[PDB]
Every structure is written in structure tokens, then in C-alpha cells.
Design a binder for these strands. Sequence first.
RNA 1: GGUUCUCCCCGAAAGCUAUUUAGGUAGCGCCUCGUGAAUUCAUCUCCGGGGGUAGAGCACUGUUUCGGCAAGGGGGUCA
Length: 72
Amino acid sequence: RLNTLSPAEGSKKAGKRLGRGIGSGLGKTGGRGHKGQKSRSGGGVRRGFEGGQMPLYRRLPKFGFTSRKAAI
RNA sequence: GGUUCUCCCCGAAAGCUAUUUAGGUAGCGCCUCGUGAAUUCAUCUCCGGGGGUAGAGCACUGUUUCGGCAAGGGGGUCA
């Protein structure tokens, strides 16, 4: 019977493979569009980057303090 | 610059804001899939609205041509 067990429907998806033909859908850059920083290998912006504008976590003021008694 | 098998369904944008930013990027707008909702939404009819655009006009702010009345101004009679 070892060649009769099957998984539940919807348990597997087979993943996404990029750049494998036209009919496969996401080929020819595999869904990352045309030129640009995001299209490059290893490209992208770090967390909180807004394109040069002051990030939200920098526009706002830090407040409060940590209490050691709260951890005990 | 290149990115390799197939079929089915839906289907954009080239805008705004910010950026040592302008051929990059972030949020929003636009696309897709899922979930939940109210005759929610669109077209038409009727009703209630506020505009100052087209047009027009010259009361006002400016500009413009002609004619009249013409304060006033010059020369001339004077006491």
C-alpha cells in the first residue's frame, strides 16, 4: 500500500519557477518588471526607506523609558 | 544585456505628493486574489442646490472715437 498514500488536496502548490518559457506565465524577468533598482539582482531599499524623505521612524520623537521592575 | 515547457481566468500605469530628487525610490491613485457587508454603486426621470465659465454688457476698475454743454486758462474793452 506504500504506493497508494496521497496527501490532502491543497496541501501542495509546487512553487513558482521564474524565467521558464512564455506559456508558464511569469517568464522574462519572472514578475519583477522592466529596468529599475528593484529589478536588479540583489536590488531593493532597506527597511523604512522612503526614497530620501525623512523616514516615519525619524520624523516622530522618541518617548518614554523602560522600567526594570516590569520584567520581574 | 540575458532570463529556457504548456494551457485557462482577470488585467494596468506612464498620475499626485516627497526626495542631492528628476532614467531611482516611498505612500496614495490604477491591477490581481481572498474575506465581510448595506436597492452600496452606475445610467435615466423628477425634485433641492451653490456657481460667475461661454455669451453679453460698460454701473464699477482701465482703455477708446465723435458731438454738445462747456467751470477754468491766454489775448483784449474797460473804472
